[PDB]
């Protein structure tokens, strides 16, 4: 009902800190994400490929254009 008091608004705010603090443990450290991200890109780039897809767009774009 939006009857939140100053004291009530403090207890809930503490819960936000408490829950968010706990989820940081599952979030992991920033340093590992630096290496993990680099590994993720290397795995993704080879598996997804799409280098030909990037080239195909350029070829189709170049073909349609008038050349003088």
């Amino acid at each position: 009902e939006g009857t939140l008091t100053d004291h009530e608004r403090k207890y809930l705010n503490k819960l936000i800190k408490r829950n968010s603090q706990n989820l940081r443990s599952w979030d992991l450290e920033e340093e590992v994400r630096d290496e993990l991200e680099d590994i993720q890109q290397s795995i993704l780039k080879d598996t997804v490929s799409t280098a030909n897809t990037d080239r195909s767009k350029r070829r189709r774009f170049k073909r349609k254009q008038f050349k003088e």
Binding site: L12, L15, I16, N19, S20, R24, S25, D27, L28, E29, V32, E35, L36, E37, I39, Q40, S42, I43, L44, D46, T47
Partner: protein, 125 residues
């Protein structure tokens, strides 16, 4: 020391092994997110905290940006890093096995009975 059949079988094992590992890994999203706003004054006052109804920490987490109302290990993370490398290791072996297989196929192809002028254009009867 090995034949073409042996190398082919190993590469196929890695390829299926790679798919199961890659499927089971999780990769963070990198796509662009855009929001459509009715009015310019609504645009200027927009902030990620209000739109998502989340705290600043959750805004950065696109995958699980929990609503604030809802809110109201070095060994462990190392095993994660080994694990992402382990998929990389399969990726490295697969290309290495592919290179060996390609060379084996070329040698057999050369041994094949042909004009081999580079092959001369000749219909095979």
């Amino acid at each position: 020391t090995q034949d073409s059949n042996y190398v082919r079988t190993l590469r196929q094992i890695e390829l299926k092994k790679l798919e199961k590992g890659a499927k089971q890994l999780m990769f963070k999203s990198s796509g662009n997110h855009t929001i459509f706003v009715d009015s310019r004054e609504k645009m200027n006052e927009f902030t990620p905290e209000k739109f998502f109804n989340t705290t600043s920490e959750m805004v950065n987490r696109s995958e699980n940006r929990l609503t604030k109302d809802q809110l109201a290990k070095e060994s462990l993370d190392k095993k994660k890093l080994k694990k992402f490398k382990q998929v990389k290791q399969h990726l490295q072996r697969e290309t290495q096995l592919k290179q060996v297989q390609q060379r084996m196929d070329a040698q057999r192809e050369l041994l094949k009975k042909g004009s081999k002028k580079k092959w001369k254009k000749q219909r095979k009867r």
